[PDB]
Design an enzyme around this catalytic site. Structure first.
Site, PDB file in Angstrom:
ATOM      1  N   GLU A   3     -74.776  37.632   0.871  1.00 33.30           N
ATOM      2  CA  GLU A   3     -73.577  36.806   0.705  1.00 33.30           C
ATOM      3  C   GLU A   3     -72.541  37.545  -0.135  1.00 33.30           C
ATOM      4  O   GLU A   3     -71.335  37.475   0.179  1.00 33.30           O
ATOM      5  CB  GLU A   3     -73.947  35.464   0.068  1.00 33.30           C
ATOM      6  N   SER A  41     -60.474  26.936   3.540  1.00 34.82           N
ATOM      7  CA  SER A  41     -61.371  26.935   2.414  1.00 34.82           C
ATOM      8  C   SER A  41     -61.719  28.359   2.014  1.00 34.82           C
ATOM      9  O   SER A  41     -61.394  29.335   2.688  1.00 34.82           O
ATOM     10  CB  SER A  41     -62.634  26.148   2.744  1.00 34.82           C
ATOM     11  N   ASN A  55     -62.074  31.439   4.381  1.00 37.60           N
ATOM     12  CA  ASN A  55     -62.563  30.994   5.663  1.00 37.60           C
ATOM     13  C   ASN A  55     -61.373  30.624   6.548  1.00 37.60           C
ATOM     14  O   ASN A  55     -60.270  30.361   6.095  1.00 37.60           O
ATOM     15  CB  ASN A  55     -63.410  29.743   5.469  1.00 37.60           C
ATOM     16  N   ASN A  67     -68.747  27.091  -0.902  1.00 41.83           N
ATOM     17  CA  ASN A  67     -67.496  26.781  -0.232  1.00 41.83           C
ATOM     18  C   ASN A  67     -66.741  25.630  -0.896  1.00 41.83           C
ATOM     19  O   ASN A  67     -67.325  24.604  -1.262  1.00 41.83           O
ATOM     20  CB  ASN A  67     -67.871  26.436   1.237  1.00 41.83           C
ATOM     21  N   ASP A 124     -79.595  19.173   0.848  1.00 45.06           N
ATOM     22  CA  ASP A 124     -78.570  18.318   1.444  1.00 45.06           C
ATOM     23  C   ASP A 124     -78.714  18.033   2.930  1.00 45.06           C
ATOM     24  O   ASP A 124     -78.021  17.135   3.423  1.00 45.06           O
ATOM     25  CB  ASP A 124     -77.171  18.911   1.226  1.00 45.06           C
ATOM     26  N   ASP A 155     -64.990  30.720  -0.053  1.00 44.40           N
ATOM     27  CA  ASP A 155     -66.337  30.845  -0.573  1.00 44.40           C
ATOM     28  C   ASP A 155     -66.280  31.639  -1.860  1.00 44.40           C
ATOM     29  O   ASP A 155     -65.611  32.667  -1.937  1.00 44.40           O
ATOM     30  CB  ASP A 155     -67.203  31.616   0.417  1.00 44.40           C
TER      31      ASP A 155
HETATM   32  C1  LIG Z   1     -76.056  18.155   7.018  1.00 46.07           C
HETATM   33  C2  LIG Z   1     -74.566  17.882   6.912  1.00 46.07           C
HETATM   34  O1  LIG Z   1     -74.362  16.507   6.588  1.00 46.07           O
HETATM   35  C3  LIG Z   1     -73.903  18.823   5.914  1.00 46.07           C
HETATM   36  N1  LIG Z   1     -72.473  18.598   5.642  1.00 46.07           N
HETATM   37  C4  LIG Z   1     -71.602  18.771   6.808  1.00 46.07           C
HETATM   38  C5  LIG Z   1     -70.421  17.832   6.804  1.00 46.07           C
HETATM   39  N2  LIG Z   1     -70.763  16.409   6.700  1.00 46.07           N
HETATM   40  C6  LIG Z   1     -71.435  15.925   7.887  1.00 46.07           C
HETATM   41  C7  LIG Z   1     -72.042  14.543   7.703  1.00 46.07           C
HETATM   42  O2  LIG Z   1     -72.477  14.256   6.566  1.00 46.07           O
HETATM   43  O3  LIG Z   1     -72.053  13.819   8.710  1.00 46.07           O
HETATM   44  C8  LIG Z   1     -69.513  15.694   6.434  1.00 46.07           C
HETATM   45  C9  LIG Z   1     -69.183  15.696   4.987  1.00 46.07           C
HETATM   46  N3  LIG Z   1     -70.334  15.304   4.168  1.00 46.07           N
HETATM   47  C10 LIG Z   1     -70.399  13.847   4.071  1.00 46.07           C
HETATM   48  C11 LIG Z   1     -71.682  13.396   3.391  1.00 46.07           C
HETATM   49  O4  LIG Z   1     -72.634  14.167   3.491  1.00 46.07           O
HETATM   50  O5  LIG Z   1     -71.671  12.318   2.777  1.00 46.07           O
HETATM   51  C12 LIG Z   1     -70.030  15.892   2.852  1.00 46.07           C
HETATM   52  C13 LIG Z   1     -70.511  17.311   2.682  1.00 46.07           C
HETATM   53  N4  LIG Z   1     -71.939  17.502   2.953  1.00 46.07           N
HETATM   54  C14 LIG Z   1     -72.803  16.935   1.927  1.00 46.07           C
HETATM   55  C15 LIG Z   1     -74.262  16.809   2.366  1.00 46.07           C
HETATM   56  O6  LIG Z   1     -74.491  16.706   3.595  1.00 46.07           O
HETATM   57  O7  LIG Z   1     -75.117  16.826   1.464  1.00 46.07           O
HETATM   58  C16 LIG Z   1     -72.194  18.935   3.161  1.00 46.07           C
HETATM   59  C17 LIG Z   1     -71.926  19.439   4.561  1.00 46.07           C
HETATM   60  C1  LIG Z   2     -71.294   9.896   8.801  1.00 43.09           C
HETATM   61  C2  LIG Z   2     -72.654  10.278   9.350  1.00 43.09           C
HETATM   62  O1  LIG Z   2     -73.347  11.263   8.503  1.00 43.09           O
HETATM   63  C3  LIG Z   2     -73.612   9.106   9.470  1.00 43.09           C
HETATM   64  N1  LIG Z   2     -75.037   9.489   9.424  1.00 43.09           N
HETATM   65  C4  LIG Z   2     -75.415  10.110  10.681  1.00 43.09           C
HETATM   66  C5  LIG Z   2     -76.581  11.006  10.496  1.00 43.09           C
HETATM   67  N2  LIG Z   2     -76.402  11.900   9.354  1.00 43.09           N
HETATM   68  C6  LIG Z   2     -75.429  12.906   9.644  1.00 43.09           C
HETATM   69  C7  LIG Z   2     -75.269  13.806   8.437  1.00 43.09           C
HETATM   70  O2  LIG Z   2     -75.485  13.266   7.326  1.00 43.09           O
HETATM   71  O3  LIG Z   2     -75.006  14.988   8.680  1.00 43.09           O
HETATM   72  C8  LIG Z   2     -77.748  12.462   9.159  1.00 43.09           C
HETATM   73  C9  LIG Z   2     -78.586  11.744   8.144  1.00 43.09           C
HETATM   74  N3  LIG Z   2     -77.844  11.392   6.932  1.00 43.09           N
HETATM   75  C10 LIG Z   2     -77.724  12.466   5.997  1.00 43.09           C
HETATM   76  C11 LIG Z   2     -76.811  12.109   4.829  1.00 43.09           C
HETATM   77  O4  LIG Z   2     -75.769  11.626   5.002  1.00 43.09           O
HETATM   78  O5  LIG Z   2     -77.277  12.374   3.708  1.00 43.09           O
HETATM   79  C12 LIG Z   2     -78.369  10.159   6.322  1.00 43.09           C
HETATM   80  C13 LIG Z   2     -77.955   8.857   7.006  1.00 43.09           C
HETATM   81  N4  LIG Z   2     -76.507   8.598   7.016  1.00 43.09           N
HETATM   82  C14 LIG Z   2     -75.967   8.249   5.683  1.00 43.09           C
HETATM   83  C15 LIG Z   2     -74.463   8.451   5.469  1.00 43.09           C
HETATM   84  O6  LIG Z   2     -73.875   9.339   6.128  1.00 43.09           O
HETATM   85  O7  LIG Z   2     -73.918   7.718   4.626  1.00 43.09           O
HETATM   86  C16 LIG Z   2     -76.070   7.647   8.044  1.00 43.09           C
HETATM   87  C17 LIG Z   2     -75.878   8.271   9.399  1.00 43.09           C
END
Ligand SMILES: C[C@@H](O)CN1CCN(CC(=O)O)CCN(CC(=O)O)CCN(CC(=O)O)CC1
Ligand SMILES: C[C@@H](O)CN1CCN(CC(=O)O)CCN(CC(=O)O)CCN(CC(=O)O)CC1
Ligand SMILES: [Cl-]
Ligand SMILES: [Cl-]
Ligand SMILES: [Cl-]
Ligand SMILES: [Cl-]
Ligand SMILES: [Cl-]
Ligand SMILES: [Cl-]
Ligand SMILES: [Gd]
Ligand code: NA
Length: 129
Positions: A35, A50, A46, A59, A101, A52
């Site tokens: 990295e 954004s 990026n 990021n 995460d 890194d």
């Molecule tokens: C595995 C992915 O979920 C990773 N993720 C991709 C982008 N996510 C997608 C989503 O959450 O559906 C949208 C933004 N995400 C909202 C949230 O997580 O509540 C915040 C950042 N997340 C925090 C995390 O996920 O721990 C890190 C990057």
């Molecule tokens: C907005 C979408 O993220 C909804 N989401 C779709 C599936 N997510 C996608 C992702 O998280 O990338 C995967 C699992 N997700 C991981 C997490 O969020 O920590 C937990 C459940 N989530 C909780 C939430 O997001 O508030 C509800 C459903």
């Protein structure tokens, strides 16, 4: 600061990153090598505007505030400049959040493409930890 390999391994271990979420120390050292080349001051912009930051190229879209990534989050609650310090504490603490995460170490593209699936223990071989 540009860390030496065993220096970084010792610091990561001290800060609890070793075996964190099941990822052995060599995984973290390998990730840092590819990295940032072990350089805490590394930065890379990026496509999406954004940036890194630091030894693990964390990021600003989600994890730190740089004031130049509109609409982003700051889930580690730090300025991104904290990730450039010679003291890796902020990087390690933020990496712990990232790896907890959803995709684990696949968050780090260089880890996925250059470390995952390899002999990562090589990266700590020879060190006194
Ligand atoms: C595995 C992915 O979920 C990773 N993720 C991709 C982008 N996510 C997608 C989503 O959450 O559906 C949208 C933004 N995400 C909202 C949230 O997580 O509540 C915040 C950042 N997340 C925090 C995390 O996920 O721990 C890190 C990057
Ligand atoms: C907005 C979408 O993220 C909804 N989401 C779709 C599936 N997510 C996608 C992702 O998280 O990338 C995967 C699992 N997700 C991981 C997490 O969020 O920590 C937990 C459940 N989530 C909780 C939430 O997001 O508030 C509800 C459903
Ligand atoms: Cl060293
Ligand atoms: Cl290892
Ligand atoms: Cl911002
Ligand atoms: Cl936030
Ligand atoms: Cl995992
Ligand atoms: Cl991410
Ligand atoms: Gd997410
Ligand atoms: Na941000």
């Amino acid at each position: 600061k540009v860390f030496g390999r065993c220096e970084l391994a010792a610091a990561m271990k001290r800060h609890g990153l070793d075996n964190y979420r099941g990822y052995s120390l060599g995984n973290w050292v390998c990730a840092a090598k590819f990295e940032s080349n072990f350089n805490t001051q590394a930065t890379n912009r990026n496509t999406d505007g954004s940036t890194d930051y630091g030894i693990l190229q964390i990021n600003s879209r989600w994890w730190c505030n740089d004031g130049r990534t509109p609409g982003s989050r700051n889930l580690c609650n730090i300025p991104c400049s904290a990730l450039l310090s010679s003291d890796i504490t902020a990087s390690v603490n933020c990496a712990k959040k990232i790896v907890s995460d959803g995709n684990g170490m696949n968050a780090w593209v260089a880890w996925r493409n250059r470390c995952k699936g390899t002999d990562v223990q090589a990266w700590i071989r020879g060190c006194r930890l």
